[PDB]
Design an enzyme around this catalytic site. Structure first.
Site, short mmCIF file in Angstrom:
data_model
loop_
_atom_site.label_atom_id
_atom_site.label_comp_id
_atom_site.label_asym_id
_atom_site.label_seq_id
_atom_site.Cartn_x
_atom_site.Cartn_y
_atom_site.Cartn_z
N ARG B 52 0.80 -1.22 0.00
CA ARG B 52 0.00 0.00 0.00
C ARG B 52 0.84 1.27 0.00
NH1 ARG B 52 -0.04 -1.55 4.38
NH2 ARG B 52 -1.25 0.03 5.53
N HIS B 84 -10.13 2.35 2.01
CA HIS B 84 -10.37 2.18 0.58
C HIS B 84 -11.87 2.21 0.29
CE1 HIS B 84 -6.36 0.19 0.81
NE2 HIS B 84 -6.23 0.59 -0.44
N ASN B 105 -9.29 7.34 -3.91
CA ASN B 105 -10.02 6.11 -3.60
C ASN B 105 -10.01 5.85 -2.10
OD1 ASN B 105 -11.40 3.63 -4.26
ND2 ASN B 105 -9.46 2.55 -3.87
N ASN B 114 -13.83 0.32 9.27
CA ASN B 114 -12.88 -0.18 8.27
C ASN B 114 -12.43 -1.61 8.54
OD1 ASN B 114 -10.88 -0.34 6.22
ND2 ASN B 114 -9.31 0.41 7.64
N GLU B 122 -16.80 -6.73 2.65
CA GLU B 122 -15.85 -6.84 1.55
C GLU B 122 -15.48 -8.30 1.31
OE1 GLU B 122 -12.92 -4.14 3.01
OE2 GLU B 122 -13.36 -2.58 1.53
MG LIG Z 1 -10.88 -0.98 4.14
#
Ligand SMILES: [Mg+2]
Ligand SMILES: [Mg+2]
EC number: 3.1.30.2
Lengths: 240, 240
Positions: B52, B84, B105, B114, B122
């Site tokens: 990252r 993200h 983003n 998160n 996700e």
């Molecule tokens: Mg995330």
């Protein structure tokens, strides 16, 4: 000929089913009516203006099904119609369309239901195929036998009139990825009833019929989707 | 490159969107964060172990977006992470994957969200692509600005930290025939929250964001499905 796509239902009283272009059906020699009827509507199957020449299903033993004579006086006594399970207008375009009027595909259905909410659902079900992105409509329909509805006056054959009717629908490929729906109507549904009010889950139908619908779907898909009402009715005019 | 399939959202503050293999994004020069990010997950896009390297998006004017230096002291002061919008792991396989780490983003997302419910969603979103019958996952995600959340301590740039995040998902071809889902999480969502409890309708998201999702769908389809919660979450482990 596959009229089920994701596996025809298991649990039917008969071990062998009748497969035709118009539909696939599992007969019940005890009730004299089909346990379930699965059909596949495509852009080329609907046809209007066809006649209704009732006939005994030639593929079954005459003692395990009804004959036209058996319905004599049925309407005046029980206010029932000769109700189609697989709809005539939605499938009359197939090569063996005449079989849609075989009594194996018929049951004594209350006139108010047959010409009411049931007909309006059939109308919306057929209309789905008019959509550009919808190429197939796979439906499974059948009766419920939960209470005595009396007996046909014109026959000595032992039979059992259904107390309700259900219909499970999904479009295109499979309920695993496409919209689906399930409905359940009591024989005594009012003539002006909105078919949208009778949405149920596939799980409820299986529990009240003893059948397993969409029997070819992976276990996980069956467990997670069968207990959840589908959103297909929204494309048929229903709300919420 | 089409990362929306049924029309990218309309209503974004910028008349021009940035199109990449990783995603399609519409930036907001006032808040400094993207209005919406649309991405397309396929069996070829996921990839693990990517680094990252946060970076200022070279496609935007430096004054309309944030730079890595702007996040200095953010975690200690607001307990936020560089969150993200389009997930790294689900799309790091594309040719311009490094753009997933461009700050256009990213947004200051609460660590508990998160690394909590948002990360769990996700995961399930990514796992959908592992199904044999699922070839595509189309997602649109973005922030909500409904309440003052403070300001990043390390920047003099005018910006607005999101108060919530939403995600609209559908599989394969179009929500018109395929399963879909919509979720909405407040920044303050507890770490151990079950993402299944945050299912909402697409309509609610549109009303709170001013955007029109799936803007290329026929009018009747939009009116019909946007107000009906989808059943896709059932395939993601949610019940009822
Ligand atoms: Mg995330
Ligand atoms: Mg009828």
């Amino acid at each position: 000929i596959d009229n089920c796509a994701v596996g025809c239902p298991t649990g039917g009283s008969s071990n062998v089913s009748i497969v035709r272009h118009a539909y696939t059906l599992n007969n019940n020699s005890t009730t004299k009516f089909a346990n379930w009827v699965a059909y596949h509507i495509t852009k080329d199957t609907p046809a209007s203006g066809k006649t209704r020449n009732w006939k005994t299903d030639p593929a079954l033993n005459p003692a395990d099904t009804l004959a036209p004579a058996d319905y004599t006086g049925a309407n005046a006594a029980l206010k029932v119609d000769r109700g189609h399970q697989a709809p005539l207008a939605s499938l009359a375009g197939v090569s063996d369309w005449e079989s849609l009027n075989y009594l194996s595909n018929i049951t004594p259905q209350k006139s108010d239901l047959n010409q009411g909410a049931w007909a309006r659902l059939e109308d919306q079900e057929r209309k789905l195929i008019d959509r550009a992105d919808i190429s197939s409509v796979y439906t499974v329909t059948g009766p419920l036998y939960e209470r005595d509805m009396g007996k046909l006056p014109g026959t000595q054959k032992a039979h059992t009139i259904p107390s309700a009717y259900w219909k499970v629908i999904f479009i295109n490929n499979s309920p695993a990825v496409n919209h689906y729906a399930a409905f359940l109507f009591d024989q005594n549904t009012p003539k002006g009833a909105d078919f949208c009010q009778f949405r149920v889950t596939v799980d409820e139908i299986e529990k009240r019929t003893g059948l397993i619908i969409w029997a070819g779907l992976p276990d996980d898909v069956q467990a997670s989707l069968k207990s959840k009402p589908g959103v297909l009715p929204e494309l048929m005019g229903c709300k919420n």
